[PDB]
């Protein structure tokens, strides 16, 4: 759909769309940029993630509102709440499938540097996690395992190739710990991962510049916030 627009123009317009809080547009511009077939830079990977994370984040929040109403309804309100929750759920699944399709065709296979490959595998884990949040049928276990497998591959690369304060490594561990707690029914694994990640980052802060320290400590605080909620 964006096939006739220049890559550089799509990137520029994604940045404008973020400033205007037009995240659906942002995501469409970044989908068009990925489909040009070239690898993405660090900055461009962040534009792609910001765009889709915000779109699906809004869908998730709406699905949760509707699912809560539906559960309370289960006086007969008729089929409308279930129908509308199903409509939002199908849209959410469609966006997740789109993101997963971009990662599979062909972002992951072309990503050789640890920073890019971990970034994309963390995204893959996240979008299977979002699918798992709404899954109920025969594929629910397989969707959960697909998230797990992507996060695990990202973890294995991150532990070999990045320092324990690297912000991508930290964000990956944060999100995988959320997976363990909220999806996999493994709260002890979630707590252990968050604690070990936090403590190993703390011990490496002394190596960092002021700007790297700020980024690592920001994500450490998120780990700590979850640990406070979970313990």
């Amino acid at each position: 759909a964006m096939g006739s627009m220049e890559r550089a123009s799509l990137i520029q317009k994604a940045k404008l769309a973020e400033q205007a809080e037009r995240y659906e547009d942002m995501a469409a511009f970044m989908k068009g940029a990925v489909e040009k077939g070239e690898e993405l830079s660090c900055e461009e990977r962040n534009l792609l993630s910001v765009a889709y994370k915000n779109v699906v984040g809004g869908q998730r929040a709406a699905w949760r509102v509707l699912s809560s109403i539906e559960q309370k309804s289960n006086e007969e309100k008729g089929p409308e709440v279930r129908e509308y929750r199903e409509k939002v759920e199908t849209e959410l699944q469609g966006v997740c499938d789109t993101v997963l399709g971009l990662l599979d065709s062909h972002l992951i296979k072309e990503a050789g540097d640890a920073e890019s490959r971990v970034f994309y595998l963390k995204m893959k884990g996240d979008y299977y996690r979002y699918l798992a949040e709404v899954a109920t049928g025969d594929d629910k276990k397989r969707i959960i395992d697909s998230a797990r497998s992507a996060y695990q591959e990202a973890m294995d690369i991150s532990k070999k190739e990045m320092p324990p304060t690297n912000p991508i490594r930290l964000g990956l561990a944060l999100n995988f710990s959320v997976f363990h707690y909220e999806i996999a029914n493994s709260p002890e694994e979630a707590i252990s991962l968050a604690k070990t990640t936090f403590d190993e980052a703390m011990a490496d802060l002394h190596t960092l510049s002021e700007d790297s320290y700020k980024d690592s400590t920001l994500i450490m605080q998120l780990l700590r916030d979850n640990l406070t909620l979970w313990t």
């Binding site: 910001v50 994370k53 996240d126 944060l174 998120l222 979850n226």
Partner: peptide
């Protein structure tokens, strides 16, 4: 609980 945000803010 909380996952990583898209931007630092």
């Amino acid at each position: 609980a909380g996952s990583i945000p898209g931007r630092r803010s």
